[PDB]
Design a protein around this ligand. Structure first.
Ligand SMILES: Cc1cc2nc3c(=O)[nH]c(=O)nc-3n(C[C@H](O)[C@H](O)[C@H](O)COP(=O)(O)OP(=O)(O)OC[C@H]3O[C@@H](n4cnc5c(N)ncnc54)[C@H](O)[C@@H]3O)c2cc1C
Ligand code: HEM
Ligand SMILES: CC(C)Oc1cccc(NC(=O)c2ccccc2C(F)(F)F)c1
Ligand code: SF4
Ligand code: F3S
Ligand code: FES
Lengths: 138, 239, 613, 102
């Protein structure tokens, strides 16, 4: 019996059976690196959705950017509420951007231990907040 | 006396239409060993003996008893019971696996995948074998340290969200670290062709460096780190 | 038959067991080109040999000039001349090659500056025939050489068409008119029964330390193959001889290897003194294993003993270079810490002699062929082999030498494979089998499955263990032993009373942990009754009423002018025990040990002598 | 055969550092050119990224076909609309710049 067959037989046996799948997400301790892995998608995705909306609205909609800004200036904008929408945008870009570096470092093999993970994890969270608060008021 | 609560996963396959649920058991820690498996074997012998699980060595070196204790994959025989009586220990089987019964998961796939990476020495001239001991320098030997002690408990692979959603086609950390073990074996002559076998979206490349695997390894090993080394080798082997 | 679904299989070879021996035999057979089934109740890697820490002996001569014939001498000197010197020759000679094949299979031995397998000192091993000092021939993979042995063996076996019946509990052999046809096994997973029949059936089930309360052996070491042999009406050689490894942790009964002593580490009592220099001036703490536990146990009776309740002696590692416990002893650094809360590098370790290895087992050729006793002579059982702790060619006799059992596995495992290669072809007619065959293994299965009795499997087991503990210990006498025998014979009766609860087909841990118990009693019946019959002290069998090593002469005085003792008046012979399945009734007999080696010219017989280490 | 899997993983890394390079470099040096490469890097990187999200979660040859298709459309459409905006309108640098002082 070869490995490929073993695998094949594993699947037919188990799919056509009364066997419960053991719990996972519902039972598994949340670790910072796992929550920081998930966020790295959300941000990535949310970000790509933004970029795509900005590309598709450039094609499917009419009016130029200044046209759109004027429209978006004349909603009696609230000076804090601008900061909100602004910081709400610089946040994911910064979190993802910093954590992005973290990954690339890992890709090189540097930093792969639980100590270094939980240090780097924090250093990202901080840097994010600094650069996010920072840029939202540039 | 110091009674401790023990919420445990149960599911009989011989009990028509039974469905997964939790039992609780109750153990005087004065009348019990320090490790969780001690508590497991105790309730097994002294209370409910329908309780089913795998165990052999009770030494933390065979890999039999790996399961999910308080939300984390470790060997029960080596994890010690929370002496804080206020908490109730939650025992489940290993995550996202098919329960055969109670705490016993079907690891055929796990082993199948192990088999698939050919975890053995491969030489180009095997005409000479068995007759002379191969030269390996103490430096060459150090490169195996931390890779060869893998006990195949399946804690790591089964703590990997990629393995959770792609374990049919994603080999996972346990197996990958072993492929790495045979890659960096000086004595082995198939390192290139071993790397070639990983060229596809799934075998190696579902690793998204989440690092639960290294975070749960009950033996202190770093499979995640090995995954990364492969990726670097993969990106740079010629031919 | 109708309640339990029965599947029939057909091979050229079945191997019960997937430890060092099992794997080696199973994969060796496959390599030789035999369609080969390997039945094992555990995943091969979870087999017990994993837990082997120390090493694997072979006179490779990487560390110094060495000769395997010196290793021969050592082993037969360790057997206390209960060792069959034909097998000891076969092993010590074939060990260099057997180890080099393991290194060549990818086993990651620790290395020298030479690039060669690193060897170490180990219990009671000499150069130049016991006059050339301590010897360094113990090959190892740091502190986890059993682990690595077992995985490289498992790994390589995948390279062949080895049929792995994993998590299958063997129930009994399929004997027919004196010949072995195969095994009948439970398939733990789906509750069904399988009859795997072959021309040759190889029993590598390992030991049965689980007959005792304290034991280094794992929960799965329950004499299952020893028992099946007994259930076939075949003898079991030497079951009395039970090695009490000296260093096993107070509470858990977990072993801290003899390689801790081989690396300069000391054994300390409660009064400061290295108590092992007085008892054995020559070899000290790195002496034979029956002698060192005898010393530790003889220190505790006096009250030289340490700890909270004056009943455990100290192993010391702390002095060595803290460097040297990182490379040579990482496995006991961790697990002495974990189970004792002890920092090996600054604190000496709390230990105590506990059961460890069984030099008894299924009687065997040097070829691995299993023997019966017919008209006072040996007879090969057709189609039936054994190897490893389960077996007994008694290459260890009355006391195993440290780091010979892993060698044993590899050598005789390989021998059985070879004996079958040599004597038959793959494809050869697989003999028939009565349709009723296996009927009774199942009937027994079913009655235990639904047992509504008064006593529980766990409690009955616990009586046996503490009995074998308080009567078949390191020291013993006819009074204690006999009380133990009738006490343990009662318990075998009690088996009809026993209570199981779990009543399913799938993964019935209760049902098998009880089948395991049946097996354990058979091993304990034969172990204790044999021990009370043996009226001498040889090896690890030490009687207080017969402190004397009883040979066919008095080998202390020079030989000639002695009147040789007749066979039935000296204890230099193998115990052969049987047991009536239905009454727990032990009958026992004797066969002489073997002294002729495989060739006088190459390896010359070592005659019995005074045994001071 | 081809070492395709390892290249793509390498490609990914490359543009990710290229893209890391451009966010600074387009604060310091806004222009037509930056605007276009910031478009080429943004869209390529995100397309491969969702690539991975898709190959992770989307099970079957059935859906993994559509998703990888519909994606590629969205990518292309997105690269083209960014290029359009760079050409006939302000261009991302100045567009962000204007958005910010507001
Ligand atoms: C802690 C410790 C350390 C040791 N260290 C050393 C050392 O350093 N050096 C050394 O030489 N020796 C050492 N020994 C002794 C040696 O390791 C063992 O004697 C040896 O491992 C036995 O090998 P085996 O294959 O015969 O048995 P095992 O390794 O016990 O294998 C038993 C096999 O039989 C199978 N089996 C059992 N019952 C059944 C059944 N009913 N049906 C099917 N299959 C079954 C099991 O699944 C398993 O595959 C040590 C022992 C212990 C406890
Ligand atoms: C300097 C800026 C950025 C860097 C350094 C960067 C880096 C990375 C890296 C390394 C990954 C892969 C991590 C992994 O799974 O192994 C990643 C994923 C991703 N990034 Fe970026 N990124 C950046 C900006 C952006 C932007 C602007 C977008 C979208 C507009 C984006 C979208 C994504 C997406 C969709 C993924 C895939 C998510 C996933 O696989 O989980 N990124 N990024
Ligand atoms: C219990 C919680 C913390 O655990 C979960 C639950 C659900 C999804 C995940 N995380 C992913 O799904 C994830 C995240 C980032 C990258 C790749 C993945 C992957 F691999 F596809 F699985 C983790
Ligand atoms: S790596 Fe650590 S966890 Fe993953 S298998 Fe080997 S031991 Fe179990
Ligand atoms: S837990 Fe999973 S995704 Fe990669 S590095 Fe670790 S394997
Ligand atoms: S039972 Fe062997 S690892 Fe816990």
């Amino acid at each position: 019996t070869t490995a490929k067959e073993e695998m094949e037989r594993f699947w037919n046996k188990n799919l056509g059976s009364n066997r419960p799948l053991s719990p996972h997400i519902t039972i598994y301790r949340w670790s910072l690196p796992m929550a920081m892995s998930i966020c790295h998608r959300g941000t990535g995705i949310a970000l790509s959705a933004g970029v795509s909306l900005f590309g598709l609205s450039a094609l499917l909609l009419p009016g130029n950017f200044e046209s759109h800004l004027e429209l978006v200036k004349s909603l009696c904008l609230g000076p804090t509420l601008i900061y909100t929408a602004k910081f709400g945008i610089v946040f994911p870009l910064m979190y993802h951007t910093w954590n992005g570096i973290r990954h690339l470092i890992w890709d090189l093999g540097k930093g792969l231990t639980i100590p270094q993970l939980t240090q780097s994890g924090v250093v990202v969270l901080i840097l994010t907040v600094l650069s996010s608060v920072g840029l939202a008021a540039m | 006396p110091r009674i401790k609560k023990f919420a445990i996963y149960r599911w009989d396959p011989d009990k028509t239409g039974d469905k997964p649920h939790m039992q609780t058991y109750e153990i005087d820690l004065n009348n019990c060993g320090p490790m969780v498996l001690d508590a497991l074997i105790k309730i097994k012998n002294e209370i409910d003996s329908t309780l089913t699980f795998r165990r052999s060595c009770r030494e933390g070196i065979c890999g039999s008893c790996a399961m999910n204790i308080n939300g984390g994959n470790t060997l029960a025989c080596t994890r010690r019971i929370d002496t804080n009586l206020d908490k109730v220990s939650k025992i489940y089987p290993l995550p996202h696996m098919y329960v055969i019964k109670d705490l016993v998961p079907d690891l055929s796939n796990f082993y199948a995948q192990y088999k698939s990476i050919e975890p053995y020495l491969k030489k180009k001239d095997e005409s000479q074998e068995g007759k002379q001991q191969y030269l390996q320098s103490i430096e060459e030997r150090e490169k195996l340290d931390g890779l060869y002690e893998c006990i195949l408990c399946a804690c790591c692979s089964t703590s990997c969200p990629s393995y959770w959603w792609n374990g049919d086609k994603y080999l996972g950390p346990a197996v990958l670290m072993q492929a790495y073990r045979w890659m960096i074996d000086s004595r082995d002559d198939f390192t290139e062709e071993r790397l070639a076998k990983l060229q596809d979206p799934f075998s190696l490349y579902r690793c998204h460096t989440i690092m639960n695997c290294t975070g749960t390894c009950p033996k202190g090993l770093n499979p995640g780190k090995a995954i990364a080394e492969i990726k670097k080798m993969m990106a740079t082997y010629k031919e | 038959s109708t309640q339990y679904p029965v599947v029939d299989h057909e091979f050229d070879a079945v191997v019960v067991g997937a430890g060092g021996a099992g794997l080696r035999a199973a994969f060796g057979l496959s390599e030789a080109g035999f369609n080969t089934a390997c039945v094992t109740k555990l995943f091969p890697t979870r087999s017990h040999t994993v837990a082997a820490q120390g090493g694997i002996n072979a006179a490779l001569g990487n560390m110094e000039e060495d000769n395997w014939r010196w290793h021969f001498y050592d082993t037969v000197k360790g057997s206390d001349w209960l060792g069959d010197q034909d097998a000891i020759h076969y092993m010590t000679e074939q060990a260099p090659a057997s180890v080099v094949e393991l290194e060549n299979y990818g086993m990651p031995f620790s290395r020298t500056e030479d690039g060669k397998i690193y060897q170490r000192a180990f219990g009671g091993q000499s150069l130049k025939f016991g006059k050339g000092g301590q010897a360094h021939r113990c090959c190892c993979v740091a502190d986890r050489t059993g682990h690595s042995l077992l995985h490289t063996l498992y790994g390589r076996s995948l390279r062949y068409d080895t049929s792995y019946f994993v998590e299958y509990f063997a129930l009994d052999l399929l004997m027919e008119n004196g010949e072995c046809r195969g095994v009948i096994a439970l398939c733990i997973e789906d509750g069904s029964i399988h009859r795997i029949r072959a021309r040759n059936t190889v029993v590598a089930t390992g030991g049965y330390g689980r007959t005792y309360f304290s034991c280094t052996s794992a929960h799965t070491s329950t004499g299952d193959g020893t028992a099946m042999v007994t259930r076939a009406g075949l003898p079991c050689q030497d079951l009395e001889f039970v090695q009490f490894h000296p260093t096993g942790i107070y509470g858990a009964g977990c072993l801290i290897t003899e390689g801790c002593r081989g690396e300069g580490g000391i054994l300390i009592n409660s009064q400061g003194e290295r108590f092992m220099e007085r008892y054995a001036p020559v070899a000290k703490d790195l002496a034979s294993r029956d002698v060192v536990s005898r010393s530790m146990t003889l220190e505790i009776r006096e009250g030289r003993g340490c700890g909270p309740e004056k009943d455990h002696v100290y192993l010391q590692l702390h002095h060595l270079p803290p460097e040297q416990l990182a490379v040579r002893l990482p496995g006991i650094s961790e697990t002495a810490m974990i189970f004792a809360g002890v920092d090996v590098t600054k604190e000496p370790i709390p230990v105590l002699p506990t059961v460890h290895y069984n030099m008894g087992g299924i009687p065997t050729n040097y070829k691995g062929q299993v023997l019966r006793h017919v008209n006072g002579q040996d007879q090969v059982v057709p189609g039936l082999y054994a190897c490893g702790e389960a077996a007994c060619a008694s290459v260890h006799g009355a006391n195993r030498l440290g780091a010979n059992s892993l060698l044993d596995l590899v050598v005789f495992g390989r021998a059985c494979a070879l004996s079958i290669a040599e004597s038959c072809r793959p494809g050869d007619k697989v003999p028939s089998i009565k349709p009723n065959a296996g009927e009774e293994s199942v009937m027994n299965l079913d009655k235990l499955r639904f047992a509504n009795g008064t006593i529980r499997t766990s409690e009955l087991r616990l009586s046996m263990q503490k009995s074998m503990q308080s009567h078949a210990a390191v020291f013993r006498v006819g009074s204690v032993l006999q009380e133990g025998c009738e006490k343990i014979l009662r318990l075998y009766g009690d088996l009809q009373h026993l209570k199981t609860f779990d009543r399913g087909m799938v993964w019935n841990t209760d049902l098998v942990e009880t089948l395991e118990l049946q097996n354990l009693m058979l091993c304990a019946l034969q172990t204790i009754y044999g021990a009370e019959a043996r009226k001498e002290s040889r090896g690890a069998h030490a009687r207080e009423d017969f402190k004397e090593r009883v040979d066919e002469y008095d080998y202390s005085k020079p030989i000639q002018g002695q009147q040789k003792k007749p066979f039935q008046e000296h204890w230099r012979k193998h115990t052969l025990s049987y047991v009536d399945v239905k009454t727990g009734k032990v009958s026992l007999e004797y066969r002489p040990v073997i002294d002729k080696t495989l060739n006088e010219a190459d390896c010359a017989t070592v005659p019995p002598a005074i045994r001071s280490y | 055969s081809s070492k395709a899997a390892s290249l793509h993983w390498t490609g990914e890394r490359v543009v990710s550092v290229l893209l890391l390079g451009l966010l600074p470099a387009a604060y310091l040096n806004p222009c037509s050119a930056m605007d276009y490469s910031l478009a080429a890097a943004l869209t390529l990187h995100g397309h491969w990224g969702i690539g991975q999200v898709v190959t992770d979660y989307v099970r079957g040859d059935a859906l993994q076909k559509v998703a990888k298709a519909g994606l590629l459309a969205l990518s292309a459409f997105t690269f083209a609309g960014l290029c359009y905006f760079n050409y006939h309108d302000v261009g991302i640098c100045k567009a962000v710049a204007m958005l910010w002082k507001l």
